[PDB]
Amino acid sequence: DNYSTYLLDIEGTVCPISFVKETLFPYFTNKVPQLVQQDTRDSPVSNILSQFHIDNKEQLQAHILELVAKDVKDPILKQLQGYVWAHGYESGQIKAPVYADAIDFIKRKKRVFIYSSGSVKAQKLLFGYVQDPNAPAHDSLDLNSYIDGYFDINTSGKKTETQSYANILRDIGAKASEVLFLSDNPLELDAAAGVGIATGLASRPGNAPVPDGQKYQVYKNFETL
Numbered sequence: 010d011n012y013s014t015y016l017l018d019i020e021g022t023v024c025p026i027s028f029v030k031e032t033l034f035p036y037f038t039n040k041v042p043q044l045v046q047q048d049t050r051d052s053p054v055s056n057i058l059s060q061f062h063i064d065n066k067e068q069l070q071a072h073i074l075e076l077v078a079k080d081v082k083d084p085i086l087k088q089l090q091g092y093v094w095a096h097g098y099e100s101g102q103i104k105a106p107v108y109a110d111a112i113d114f115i116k117r118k119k120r121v122f123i124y125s126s127g128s129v130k131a132q133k134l135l136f137g138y139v140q141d142p143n144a145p146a147h148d149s150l151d152l153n154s155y156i157d158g159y160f161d162i163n164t165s166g167k168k169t170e171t172q173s174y175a176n177i178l179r180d181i182g183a184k185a186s187e188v189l190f191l192s193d194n195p196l197e198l199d200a201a202a203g204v205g206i207a208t209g210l211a212s213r214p215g216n217a218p219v220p221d222g223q224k225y226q227v228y229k230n231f232e233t234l
């Protein structure tokens with residue numbers, strides 16, 4: 010095809026932007042009280058919880074819920090989230106709603122890398138438990154065997170800085186002209202375009218509107234790519 014490699018944003022690009030707020034955050038916040046109130050010092054979750062450095066369980070419970078409500082990027086929160094979400098996914102309580110055409114795209118393209126604000130471990134977990142478009146309530150699908158790599162803010166830098174894309178090109182080992190980057194955020198695409206990577210503006214139901222006067226090619230789905 011036109012490109013050797015594809016770089017994909019997650020939220021608003023391959024997954025509905027509604028997933029994190031309608032499903033992941035509420036799932037996690039509903040589980041918090043039980044895990045905090047049950048206090049066995051020797052647990053794998055107990056080691057995570059101790060890294061908040063708050064001994065009072067009422068204060069700890071309130072603090073965790075505050076961090077979620079204020080969208081605070083605390084790595085101890087992300088680990089706690091990872092632990093709760095892993096069990097949610099493994100138990101079948103949650104499934105990642107990847108668009109049917111994004112599933113097909115990932116399965117057919119030869120070189121596919123993910124770049125997201127979520128950590129690499131969280132991305133791998135999301136792509137391991139994908140909702141089956143043919144039967145949402147049946148078993149989830151594993152797309153990890155179709156993904157060649159994952160990038161996050163820690164591995165590569167901020168999504169709006171050109172340098173971050175230079176870091177990804179180094180790790181991908183591809184000429185910038187051979188890479189297409191798909192994202193719903195124009196500021197990400199602008200950063201990518203600074204190092205010569207081709208760009209495409211993903212448009213999905215629930216995303217912020219696309220202004221009439223805008224420079225990027227718009228993709229409503231990935232069937233034509």
Ligand SMILES: [Mg+2]
Pocket residue numbers: 018019020021022192193194
């Ligand atoms: Mg996005």
